[PDB]
């Protein structure tokens, strides 16, 4: 939902006010900042009243900027949680106050209840019409309709739900476009998919990840040494004749402790979970996402699918005398039964070229043939036409089986498509071929370049296909995978997982979830494809909504991006304190030891201006690093040492250098404004 | 009471070894191999000691080579109280003491150079310093020569006789043993 | 030594104790 | 001057490396549990006689063994110091020590700190100096090397639950490393002018007719293990400026080599036991770079010494105040940095008479954790804690869960690493704060201005970091000072030893994965610079305000 839009920024500035200590003591660094802010505000009120002599305006400005720092730290977490919950609120925008219709008999034509009751128990029978909303998750008893799964996929695409097979599984939040279905209720409200996604977006940082725990341990230790130095600085400076003012002490304490990473840690975690959920990968917690960054080998899965999912439809090619609209309609109608990402991408190309959208099921009287691994086909028999879609050799065997011969007009087209390298698919309708379609690569750099980058980063890639060795070698050569496994059994898969886990590696595997359940249980990071959500998310093995075998690449990249964002902002927060010392120490000891003005390498105006500039920079660096925490770090896939060198050059030297420039320009603004 | 017996056993064994075998063997080997070095480097004639060869004494006479200042307790060159004056650079007491030592050295050496050596005006780390550099010892040649009625070449060759140097010039400094030089000056009066 | 000094000392002691307790129990924080 | 200093540093590092390579191999053999050649059989019958036998025990029993031996030694030394006038070898008829002085001396000699608040030559008898202090000089060094042996064994072993026999480790270390090397060093010192007699104090007829009472006693036996174990507990009030302890530049060079012998050999042994010598070379390169930079800075600050000497009528401006004339200002600066970074209390120059800039870097090397060639393992595990912090930061910076030598690091190990990092600056800061809020702590002061606060900070850093080097102008013989310093040494030893052994017990039970292309290389110039940067940066962000109020203020003035 863009970056910082005013329709939600103000709505979460209403929610920044978590300033009560009951919601602040869970974060120790900002509870320290909150305690220091309260102390400085109380002593500034005392100074203004006349309890002790002092400026009573510089201290008030210091307290106000400390409160502004706490507000900015809460604002980062508020933006992260709002961006996490925005898509769930949009899902609940059509779910709340919706027309839910419930029947009285399981058959069609029965009396219907016009009451939107959300207390539907097991065995409850509901019916929906065209342009309606499903009440909850369930199984379709009978019927056939075009359902748009946009509410849970994030992109609009029609699917077919019908009785029989694996197509009798419809969820709640998605709308129904074309026809009527009757649905038996399968789960109680409370464990449904929409409630589980709501609990995902509101159950942020309930179970803290071990990386966040250890980083919190580091931040607590840094806060402890900084608090010890700042607190013991008062008896050290009392020997010089006059003591350091405690407002200066609290300001130096807040400027020293890592408030940047200390305020942006929860923002990093929630934004990383939002990036996970925006890629249509659903995990119970961030522990598996972080463990995906620790893996040394990736085990892919392309049984039941064509290619690795990186190739998707881009263009439609008529053969001869065939309308492109008719060819796209036939391909879309054949790819309704194809749940594989290529079969979905045919529908995306058809709707982006002609906007077919809604179809009709009962008037067609069509029987759907689901996609199978052994046939590599996805067809549909509408009345009598044998509409089928599959690979070129599969269609060649199909026309060798039937009486119609394969025409020789499309040999030039299939050779041309192979010449640009896209894999070709052929649609056949009874005995004729109306066109050959191309599946262009989606990755801009190339899937071979992506796998080479992952090999450079130290993660091996293993592609399991369950096919012949002639096809497997070609698929591995076109994809760029390091090694391939063919004719795979679950026992051999488990043996491969164990022998890769034995030699000091962590194995991440995608799979079906039901057909690959022991392998996914043995693997440390598990992703399920084409799996039932209610019977999958309770067991684990993180749900992939697109069923794309290459989603593990994005999961690994997002987890590593989270880890690198945390490390880079920790390095920035630690490195800022050198310039914080160079700004505050001559300002703090300007009267106790007046010879200490030689350490003022920056030509700052007054000690009050220097301390105020340091506090203003500490407040403003959090806002200046909100976009970096929300979007992650723009990391380049290289080796480990080269990545460490590049990140050190960007962030450690940056946090060494730019606080000097920031404090100097803030003091320049203060001098030209005349505040000091 | 479980591991108490091996703990007490190894503690008693290590205590008796490291406190009554290693020092006993070290003492026996030292007294066997290096007498006059394990016994204090004492200078003996007539069965009467006149000082160790390493310690150094407070020389205030006109005919003797003055050592570094000491600033020990209850006595200038007190071997019972080691440790020099722990006066920092910023301490004005150190500046007062150094100014007094410079004035006293310029009064004692009127025919020498006006720039006194640093070792003769700054107190050592321990007050029991028997060593000065050959430059600082050669700075005070004319006063000792006038007091002892000897010659500059004779004092220079005596200093070069009683000057010891390290194996390489950077692990230390060339030094002059003050005590045996002053007993040599006493022996040269006959 | 003084009332303000001893209140500052006890406040620093409570802050250090809270941070030490947060470091020991870091999963709950 | 600069060329002579560079030659001195280069030859010191060269002789140190070529001396500590075979001792590194021998210490690696001691870690790997293979007995030394020619020692087995005798070692077997000695272990059977002592009843230690074969007790392969875990980290809890190892830590209980170390703490039990340390408390037994503390009780024995405390009662010996209280009852030293009821014991033989007391020719001066010295009385028994007071309760505070005896407690402070016992804690400082058991916790490998070796703080001499008294004057030993007029405080201690020969039997006390030989049987409590030398025995604790052996025992604290053996305990530190045994703890770092346990840490190296924990990093090496795969999925075990035990850590080796602590008594076997202590007996092997003391019998085959600490005794014969110090015997050779002591006999070299007796070949030079050091003392190994037991005679009463010699009355001296001074040439002018004055009287001198030379303290003559078993000096070289205590001096050798003082230098070898990085103890720093001198026989006399002068720690190593006294000519009966350091009579020759050759003696001082052997002293410096003995000070750095055990840390360099322990790093070499670590690199040999884990099978990758580049891992030990990483630590050696980091310590060597920081050490060379600190020696050069202190050498320059001491060459450009007192600026008032030129105005007061001196030909040279070198800070020869509080420095022995047998040694150069360069040699005094080098020895200052060597013992001050190596957790050794020995001084050949008075550190209180140093320049402000030349005394800032010593107390900074103290306050960073005494990790630059520090201690007999006592700073090696501190460097290991800094390596754990550095691999945590670098693993997060590259995007992987952190691991050192293939062993993953988790919440418990990071908690204990953070606590072990936290223990000693906490002790420094609250000890100095308690010292500077009390007239009993501010009445021990000798130099006015910020140098007095520098003295207080140096003394509390000596107690907490187990160094024992003293800004000797402080009169730390008060009961309050003795109790505060004893508390600081006790916590700074046994609140760092305990979490290191807890990390060892948490790391024995982990598999070490094989290194891959994505595995972070923990050697090379990048990781050496990263370790140097994180040690320097942690020390700076902890201790810039104290140095600014002390030595920086004294420098500027
Ligand atoms: C004045 C220059 C300032 C810097 C001095 C640099 C000194 C060494 C330079 C070498 C670095 C470049 C080599 C690239 C190869 C890459 C492989 C690698 O990492 O190995 C490196 C290099 C080579 O080891 P290797 O042969 O690959 O090891 C395989 C062995 O099987 C395993 O056995 P091992 O590792 O235990 O022992 C190896 C040994 C086999 O054992 C023996 O045969 C016994 C000999 C003992 C070891 C040798 C003595 C080392 C003394 C070093 C210090 C002396 C001078 C220091 C100057 C201080 C003043 C600035 O083989 C050798 O003889 C080593 C050859 C190289 C040492 C040269 C001798 C000293 C001359 C100094 C000038 C050289 C300048 C070259 C370029 C400068 C680059 C910055 O290792 C070393 O550095 C020496 C090993 C022992 C010391 C451990 C490290 C301590 C740190 C060194 C001191 C640094 C001073 C502080 C820096 C100042 C900046 C502020
Ligand atoms: C603030 C952050 C901003 C900057 C950070 C990033 C800086 C990186 C500089 C990048 C520029 C060049 C890029 C191209 C690299 C190609 C060179 C190469 O082959 O790789 C070498 C190296 C990669 O190391 P590696 O891959 O881990 O090595 C594993 C090897 O398998 C095993 O390697 P090996 O052991 O076989 O070594 C062979 C060879 C490898 O190199 C070569 O092939 C030689 C030809 C290329 C020369 C480059 C390296 C040679 C020595 C470095 C000189 C350091 C001076 C500084 C200049 C920086 C630019 C080089 O090296 C030697 O010849 C020497 C052998 C002895 C090994 C140890 C020597 C220690 C070096 C002296 C101390 C290090 C710096 C101390 C200052 C501390 C900073 C506070 O890349 C570098 O150039 C790194 C230089 C390190 C200098 C600065 C490091 C600062 C790190 C951050 C400090 C702040 C901490 C933050 C904490 C905050 C949170 C608490
Ligand atoms: O693609 V599979 O890992 O189910 O053989
Ligand atoms: K820390
Ligand atoms: K900061
Ligand atoms: K020590
Ligand atoms: K000492
Ligand atoms: K520290
Ligand atoms: K430390
Ligand atoms: K320490
Ligand atoms: K220690
Ligand atoms: K710290």
Q: What residue spans of A602-639 are helical by DSSP H?
A: 607-624, 626-631
What is the bridge-based pairing of β-strands A181-185 and A138-148? Answer: antiparallel
Binding residues of A for ATP are 338, 342, 371-378, 389
D200-204 long-range contacts, CB within 8 A, separation 24+: D200/D91, D200/D92, D201/D91, D201/D92, D202/B40, D202/B42, D202/B49, D203/B49, D204/B49, D204/B50, D204/B51, D204/B52, D204/B57, D204/B79
Active-site choice (A137, A179, A301, A546) = A301
Q: Among residues B154, B149, B148, B158, which one has the least CA distance to residue B186? A: B148
List strands edge to edge, sheet with A423-429. Answer: A311-315, A432-441, A423-429, A386-391, A380-381, A367-368
The alpha carbon of residue C15 is apart from the nearest alpha carbon of chain D, in Å, by 14
Query: Is A106 in contact with A125 (CB distance < 8 Å)?
Result: yes
Query: Is A257 in contact with A620 (CB distance < 8 Å)?
Result: no
* C-alpha neighbours within 13 Å on the C-beta side of residue B71: 21
What are the Cα distances from residue D133, in Å, to D102, D184, D234, D482?
12, 20, 10, 17
> Residue D452 contacts by C-beta under 8 Å, 6 or more apart in sequence?
A239, D442, D445, D446
DSSP 3-state of A561: helix
Residues of C in contact with D418 (CB under 8 A): 23
Beta partners for residue A281, in sequence order? A544
What are the Cα distances from residue A253, in Å, to A232, A573, A590, A615, D315?
12, 14, 18, 10, 48
Which residue of A224, A233, A457 is in closest CB contact with D545?
A233
State which CATH number among 3.40.50.720, 3.40.1110.10, 1.10.3720.10, 3.30.1360.170 fits the domain covering A325-440. Answer: 3.40.1110.10
* First vs last C-alpha separation in chain D: 27
Closest residue by Cα to atom 41, ligand 2, is: D525
Give one word for B40, left, alpha or beta, with left for phi > 0 and alpha for psi -120 to 50: left
Is the beta carbon of A163 within 6 A of some atom in ligand 3? Answer: no
Query: Is A306 in contact with A395 (CB distance < 8 Å)?
Result: no
Closest residue by Cα to atom 3, ligand 3, is: A301
Q: What residue spans of D32-133 are helical by DSSP H?
A: 42-50, 59-82, 99-110, 126-128
Residues of the domain holding B160: 41-187
Is D415–C23 a contact, with Cβ atoms under 8 angstroms apart?
yes
Sequence length of chain D is 557
Task: Read off the DSSP letter of residue A280.
Answer: T
Provide the token pair at A147: 């359902």
Q: Give the count of domains, chain C.
A: 1
Is the beta carbon of D10 within 6 A of some atom in ligand 1? Answer: yes
> Residue D119 contacts by C-beta under 8 Å, 6 or more apart in sequence?
B81, B82, B83, D236, D237
What is the bridge-based pairing of β-strands A297-299 and A311-315? Answer: unpaired
What dihedral angle (degrees, nearest 10) is formed by the CA atoms of D56, D61, D63, D65?
Answer: -80
Q: Among residues B178, B88, A539, which one has the least CA distance to residue D445? A: B88
Interatomic CA distance for residues B26 and D220, integer angstroms:
8
Residue C25 contacts A where some CB pair is shorter than 8 Å: no
Interatomic CA distance for residues D293 and D365, integer angstroms:
11
Closest residue by Cα to atom 2, ligand 3, is: A301
Q: Among residues D343, D331, D324, D504, which one has the least CA distance to residue D409? A: D504
Type and span of the H or E element at D269: helix D249-273
Beta partners for residue A427, in sequence order? A389, A435
Sequence length of chain A is 676
Q: What is the 3-state secondary structure (H, E, C) of D428-461?
A: HHHHHHHHHCCHHHHCCCCCCCHHHHHHHHHHHH
Query: What is the CA D423 to chain-centroid distance, rounded?
Result: 17
Residue recorded with tokens 């999961």: A555
Task: Read off the DSSP letter of residue A404.
Answer: P
Mutate to test the pocket of ligand 2, among D391, D525, D540 (most ligand atoms within 8 A of CB): D525
Query: Is A559 in contact with A292 (CB distance < 8 Å)?
Result: yes
The alpha carbon of residue A14 is apart from the nearest alpha carbon of chain D, in Å, by 34
Please give all residues whose CB falls under 5 A of ion ligand 10, grouped by chain where several chains appear: D 382, 424
Provide the token pair at C7: 């209140």
Residue recorded with tokens 């503690």: B11
Provide the token pair at D470: 């003293």
Assess whether B79 and B107 both reside in one domain: yes
> Interface partners of D (3+ CB pairs, < 8 Å)?
A, B, C
Task: Read off the DSSP letter of residue D214.
Answer: E
What is the bridge-based pairing of β-strands A132-133 and A102-103? Answer: unpaired
Interatomic CA distance for residues D366 and D283, integer angstroms:
18
Residues of A in contact with D393 (CB under 8 A): 567, 570-571
Q: Do chains B and A touch (3 or more CB pairs under 8 A)?
A: no
Provide the token pair at A351: 């709707």
DSSP 3-state of D75: helix
The C-alpha R_g of chain B, in whole angstroms, comes to 22
Residue A278: count of CB within 10 angstroms of its CB: 15
Is the beta carbon of A567 within 6 A of some atom in ligand 2? Answer: no
What is the bridge-based pairing of β-strands A525-529 and A543-544? Answer: parallel
Is the beta carbon of D21 within 6 A of some atom in ligand 1? Answer: yes
Residue A578: count of CB within 10 angstroms of its CB: 18
Interatomic CA distance for residues B116 and B137, integer angstroms:
11
What is the bridge-based pairing of β-strands A138-148 and A158-162? Answer: antiparallel
Q: Among residues D420, D351, D440, D435, which one has the least CA distance to residue D380? A: D420
Q: Among residues D300, D221, D295, which one has the least CA distance to residue D260? A: D295
Query: Is A364 in contact with A382 (CB distance < 8 Å)?
Result: yes
A279-282 long-range contacts, CB within 8 A, separation 24+: A279/A551, A279/A554, A279/A555, A279/A558, A280/A153, A280/A154, A280/A544, A280/A545, A280/A546, A280/A551, A281/A527, A281/A542, A281/A543, A281/A544, A281/A545, A281/A551, A281/A554, A281/A555, A282/A197, A282/A200, A282/A537, A282/A542, A282/A543, A282/A545
- D134-156 vs D380-398: helix crossing angle, rounded to 10: 30
Residue A498: count of CB within 10 angstroms of its CB: 11
DSSP 3-state of B43: strand
Residue D161: count of CB within 10 angstroms of its CB: 12
Residue A35 contacts C where some CB pair is shorter than 8 Å: yes
Task: Read off the DSSP letter of residue A161.
Answer: E
* First vs last C-alpha separation in chain B: 76
Interatomic CA distance for residues A489 and A81, integer angstroms:
43
Query: How much helix, strand and coil, in percent to the nearest 5, is found in chain A?
Result: 50, 15, 35
Residues of A in contact with D520 (CB under 8 A): 640-641, 644
Interatomic CA distance for residues D215 and D221, integer angstroms:
15
Residues of the domain holding C1: 1-29
Query: Is C16 in contact with A227 (CB distance < 8 Å)?
Result: yes
Residue A561 contacts D where some CB pair is shorter than 8 Å: yes
Is the beta carbon of A671 within 6 A of some atom in ligand 3? Answer: no
> Residue D323 contacts by C-beta under 8 Å, 6 or more apart in sequence?
B122, B124, B125, D329, D332, D348, D349, D350, D353
Beta partners for residue A125, in sequence order? A184
Query: Is A9 in contact with A3 (CB distance < 8 Å)?
Result: no
Q: Among residues D246, D224, D2, D472, which one has the least CA distance to residue B131? A: D246
Query: Is A313 in contact with A348 (CB distance < 8 Å)?
Result: yes
CA of D524 to the centre of ligand 2 (A): 6
Nearest 5°: the CA angle A609, A613, A615 is 120
What are the Cα distances from residue D52, in Å, to D48, D74, D145, D439?
7, 22, 19, 51
Q: Give the count of domains, chain B.
A: 2
Query: Is A300 in contact with A552 (CB distance < 8 Å)?
Result: yes
Task: Read off the DSSP letter of residue A421.
Answer: T
Residue recorded with tokens 């709505």: A11
Is D518–A640 a contact, with Cβ atoms under 8 angstroms apart?
yes
Interatomic CA distance for residues B10 and B18, integer angstroms:
12
Q: Do chains B and D touch (3 or more CB pairs under 8 A)?
A: yes
Interatomic CA distance for residues D203 and D210, integer angstroms:
10
DSSP 3-state of A441: strand
Residue C28 contacts D where some CB pair is shorter than 8 Å: no
* Nearest ligand to the CA atom of D137: 6
Using CA coordinates, name the residue in chain D closest to C2.
D437
Interatomic CA distance for residues D447 and B167, integer angstroms:
38
Interatomic CA distance for residues A91 and A82, integer angstroms:
14
* First vs last C-alpha separation in chain C: 36
Residue B148: count of CB within 10 angstroms of its CB: 17
State the burial class of residue B92 (Cβ atoms within 10 Å of its Cβ: 0-12, 13-18, 19+).
Answer: exposed
Is C19–A224 a contact, with Cβ atoms under 8 angstroms apart?
yes
Query: Is D151 in contact with D381 (CB distance < 8 Å)?
Result: yes
Provide the token pair at A76: 């980062």
Interatomic CA distance for residues D494 and C29, integer angstroms:
28
- Quickly list DSSP for A489-532: -HHHHHHHHHHHHHTT--EEEEE-SSTTHHHHHHSSEEEEES--
Query: How much helix, strand and coil, in percent to the nearest 5, is found in chain B?
Result: 40, 10, 50
Active site annotation includes A301: yes
Q: What residue spans of D83-165 are helical by DSSP H?
A: 99-110, 126-128, 134-156
Sequence length of chain C is 29
Task: Read off the DSSP letter of residue B56.
Answer: -
Residue recorded with tokens 């960054």: A293
Task: Read off the DSSP letter of residue A18.
Answer: -
What are the Cα distances from residue A399, in Å, to A366, A393, A403, A435, D429?
22, 10, 7, 15, 87
Is A589–D436 a contact, with Cβ atoms under 8 angstroms apart?
no
Binding residues of A for Mg(2+) are 512, 516
Provide the token pair at A106: 């399981």
Query: Is A525 in contact with A559 (CB distance < 8 Å)?
Result: no
Provide the token pair at B157: 């060759």
Domain spans in chain D, listed from the N-terminal domain onward: 2-201+213-273, 277-311+328-556
**Number of helices and strands (H, E) in chain A?**
23, 21
Beta partners for residue D243, in sequence order? none
CA of D417 to the centre of ligand 4 (A): 8
Residue recorded with tokens 């020569």: B145
> Residue A344 contacts by C-beta under 8 Å, 6 or more apart in sequence?
A157, A335, A338, A546
Interatomic CA distance for residues A396 and A401, integer angstroms:
9
Assess whether B34 and B50 both reside in one domain: no
Interatomic CA distance for residues A135 and A141, integer angstroms:
15
Query: Is A568 in contact with A252 (CB distance < 8 Å)?
Result: no
Provide the token pair at A51: 């309890």
Experimental method: cryo-EM
Assess whether B83 and B114 both reside in one domain: yes
Stated resolution in angstroms: 3.3
């Amino acid at each position: 939902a863009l970056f910082e839009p005013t329709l939600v920024v103000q709505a979460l500035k209403e929610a920044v006010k978590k300033l009560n200590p009951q919601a602040q003591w869970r974060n120790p660094v900002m509870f320290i900042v909150w305690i220091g802010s309260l102390l400085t505000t109380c002593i500034s009120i005392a100074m203004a009243s006349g309890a002790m002599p002092g400026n009573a305006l510089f201290s008030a400005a210091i307290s106000g900027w400390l409160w502004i720092t706490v507000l900015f730290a809460n604002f980062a977490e508020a933006l992260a949680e709002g961006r996490s919950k925005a898509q769930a609120n949009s899902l609940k925008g059509v779910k709340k106050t919706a027309f839910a219709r419930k029947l009285r008999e399981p058959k069609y034509g029965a009396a219907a209840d016009k009451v939107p009751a959300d207390q539907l128990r097991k065995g409850d029978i509901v019916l929906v019409e065209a342009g309606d909303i499903i009440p909850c998750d369930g199984e379709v008893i009978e019927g056939g309709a075009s359902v748009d799964e946009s509410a849970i996929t994030g992109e609009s695409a029609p699917v077919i739900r019908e009785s029989g097979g694996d197509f009798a599984s419809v969820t709640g939040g998605t709308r129904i476009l074309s026809d009527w279905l009757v649905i038996e209720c399968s789960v109680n409200p409370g464990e449904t998919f929409l409630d589980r996604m709501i609990a995902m977006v509101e159950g942020a940082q309930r179970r803290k990840t071990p990386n966040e725990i250890a980083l919190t341990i580091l931040l607590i230790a840094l806060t402890i040494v900084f608090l010890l130095a700042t607190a013991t600085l008062w008896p050290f400076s009392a020997w010089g004749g006059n003591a350091v003012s405690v407002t200066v002490l609290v300001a130096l304490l807040v400027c020293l402790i890592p408030t940047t990473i200390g305020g942006l840690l929860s923002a990093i975690g929630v934004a990383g979970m939002s990036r996970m959920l925006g890629a249509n990968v659903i995990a119970t917690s961030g522990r598996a996402v972080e463990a995906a960054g620790d893996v040394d080998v990736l085990l892919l899965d392309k049984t039941g699918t064509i290619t690795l999912g990186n190739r998707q439809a881009s263009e439609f090619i008529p053969a001869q005398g065939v309308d492109e609209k008719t060819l796209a309609d036939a391909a879309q109608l054949a790819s309704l039964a194809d749940e594989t990402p290529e079969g979905r991408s045919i529908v995306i190309l058809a709707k982006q070229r002609f906007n077919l959208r809604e179809r009709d099921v009962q008037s067609l009287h069509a029987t759907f043939v689901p996609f199978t691994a052994q046939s590599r086909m996805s067809g549909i028999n509408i009345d009598n036409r044998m509409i089928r879609k599959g690979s070129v050799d599969a269609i060649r065997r199909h026309v060798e089986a039937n009486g119609g011969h394969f025409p020789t007009d499309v040999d030039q087209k299939v050779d041309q498509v192979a010449r640009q390298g896209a894999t070709p698919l052929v649609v056949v309708e009874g005995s004729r071929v109306l066109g050959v379609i191309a599946l262009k690569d989606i990755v801009k750099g190339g899937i071979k370049e992506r796998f080479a980058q992952l090999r450079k980063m130290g993660i091996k890639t293993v592609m399991i296909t369950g096919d012949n060795r002639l096809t497997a070698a070609a698929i591995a050569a076109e994809a760029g995978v390091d090694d391939f496994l063919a004719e795979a059994t679950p026992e051999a898969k488990l043996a491969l997982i164990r022998q890769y886990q034995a030699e000091g590696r962590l194995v991440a595997m995608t799979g079906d979830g039901t057909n690959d359940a022991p392998a996914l249980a043995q693997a440390d990071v598990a992703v399920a494809m084409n799996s039932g959500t209610q019977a999958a998310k309770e067991a684990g093995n993180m749900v992939d909504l697109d069923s794309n075998p290459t989603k593990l690449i994005e999961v690994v990249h997002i987890g590593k991006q989270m880890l690198m964002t945390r490390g880079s902002l920790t390095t920035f927060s630690i490195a800022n304190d050198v310039a914080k010392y160079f700004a505050i120490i001559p300002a703090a000891f300007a009267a106790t030891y007046p010879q200490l003005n030689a350490l003022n390498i920056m030509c700052l105006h007054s000690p009050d201006s220097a301390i105020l500039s340091a506090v203003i920079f500490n407040a403003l660096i959090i806002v200046f690093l909100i976009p970096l925490a929300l979007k992650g770090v723009s990391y380049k896939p290289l080796t480990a040492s080269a990545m460490l060198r590049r990140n050190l050059w960007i962030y450690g030297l940056g946090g060494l250098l730019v606080p000097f420039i920031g404090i100097k320009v803030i003091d320049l603004l203060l001098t030209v404004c005349g505040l000091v | 009471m479980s591991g108490l017996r091996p703990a007490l056993s190894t503690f008693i064994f290590l205590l008796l070894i490291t406190g009554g075998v290693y020092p006993l063997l070290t003492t026996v080997l030292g007294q066997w191999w290096f007498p006059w070095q394990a016994n204090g480097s004492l200078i003996r004639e007539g069965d009467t000691v006149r000082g160790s060869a390493l310690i150094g004494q407070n020389f205030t006479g006109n005919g003797y080579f003055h050592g570094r200042p000491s600033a020990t307790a209850e006595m200038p060159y007190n071997p019972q109280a080691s440790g020099g004056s722990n006066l920092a650079v910023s301490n004005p007491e150190l500046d007062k003491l150094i100014a007094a030592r410079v004035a006293a050295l310029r009064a004692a050496n009127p025919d020498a150079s006006a720039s006194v050596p640093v070792e003769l005006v700054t107190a050592s780390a321990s007050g029991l310093d028997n060593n000065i550099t050959p430059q600082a010892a050669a700075w005070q040649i004319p006063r000792v020569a006038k007091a002892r009625n000897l010659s500059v070449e004779q004092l220079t060759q005596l200093i070069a006789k009683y000057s010891q140097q390290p194996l390489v010039k950077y692990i230390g400094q060339p030094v002059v043993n003050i005590v045996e030089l002053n007993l040599a000056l006493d022996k040269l009066d006959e | 030594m003084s009332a303000g000094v001893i209140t500052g000392v006890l406040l620093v002691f409570l802050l250090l104790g809270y941070l030490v307790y947060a470091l020991i129990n870091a999963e709950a924080f | 001057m600069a060329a002579q200093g560079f030659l001195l540093i280069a030859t010191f590092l060269l002789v140190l490396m070529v001396l500590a390579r075979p001792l590194g191999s021998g210490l690696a053999r001691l870690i790997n549990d293979i007995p030394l050649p020619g020692t087995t059989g005798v070692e077997r019958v000695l272990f059977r006689a002592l009843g230690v036998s074969d007790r392969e025990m875990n980290w809890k029993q190892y830590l209980c063994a170390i703490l039990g031996l340390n408390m037994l030694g503390l009780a024995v030394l405390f009662f010996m110091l209280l009852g030293q006038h009821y014991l033989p070898l007391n020719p001066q008829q010295l009385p028994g020590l007071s309760w505070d002085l005896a407690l402070n001396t016992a804690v400082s000699f058991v916790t490998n700190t070796n703080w001499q608040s008294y004057s030993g030559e007029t405080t201690l008898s020969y039997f006390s100096q030989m049987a409590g202090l030398t025995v604790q000089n052996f025992l604290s060094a053996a305990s530190g090397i045994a703890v770092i042996f346990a840490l190296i064994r924990a990093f090496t072993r795969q999925s075990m639950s035990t850590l080796g026999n602590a008594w076997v480790d202590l007996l092997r270390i003391t019998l085959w490393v600490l005794v014969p090397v110090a015997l050779l060093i002591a006999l070299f010192f007796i070949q030079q002018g050091a003392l190994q007699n037991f005679l009463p104090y010699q009355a001296v007829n001074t040439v002018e007719g004055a009287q001198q009472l030379l303290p003559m006693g078993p000096v070289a036996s205590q001096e050798a293990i003082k230098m070898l174990g990085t103890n720093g507990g001198g026989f006399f009030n002068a720690n190593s400026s006294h000519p009966f302890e350091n009579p020759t530049a050759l003696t001082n060079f052997v002293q410096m080599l003995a000070i750095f012998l055990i840390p360099t050999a322990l790093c070499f042994a670590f690199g040999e036991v884990m099978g990758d010598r580049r891992q030990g070379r990483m630590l050696l390169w980091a310590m060597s770079v920081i050490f060379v930079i600190c020696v050069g800075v202190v050498m320059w600050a001491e060459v450009q010494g007192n600026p008032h000497l030129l105005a007061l009528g001196t030909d040279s401006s070198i800070n020869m105040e509080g420095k022995e004339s047998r040694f150069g200002v360069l040699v005094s600066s080098l020895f200052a940095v060597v013992t001050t970074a190596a957790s050794c209390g020995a001084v050949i120059a008075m550190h209180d008479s140093f320049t402000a800039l030349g005394g800032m870097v010593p107390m900074w090397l103290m306050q960073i954790g005494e990790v630059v060639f520090g201690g007999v393992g006592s700073g090696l595990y501190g460097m290991m804690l800094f390596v754990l912090l550095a691999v945590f930061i670098a693993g997060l910076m590259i995007g992987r869960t952190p691991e050192y030598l293939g062993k993953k690091i988790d919440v418990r190990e990071m908690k204990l690493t953070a606590l072990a990092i936290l223990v000693t600056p906490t002790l420094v800061l609250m000890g100095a704060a308690l010292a500077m809020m009390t007239d009993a702590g501010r009445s021990a002061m000798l130099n006015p201005g910020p140098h007095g606060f520098s003295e207080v900070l140096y003394a509390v850093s000596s107690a907490a970091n187990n160094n024992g080097s003293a800004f000797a102008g402080l009169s730390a013989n008060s009961p309050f000072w003795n109790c505060l310093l004893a508390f600081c040494m006790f916590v700074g030893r046994f609140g760092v030893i305990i979490p290191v052994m807890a990390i060892a017990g948490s790391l024995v039970s982990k598999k070490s994965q094989a290194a891959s292309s994505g595995t972070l290389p923990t050697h090379g110039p990048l990781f050496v610079g990263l370790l140097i940067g994180t040690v320097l940066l942690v020390g700076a962000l902890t201790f810039i305000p104290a140095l600014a109020l002390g030595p920086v203020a004294e420098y500027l003035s």
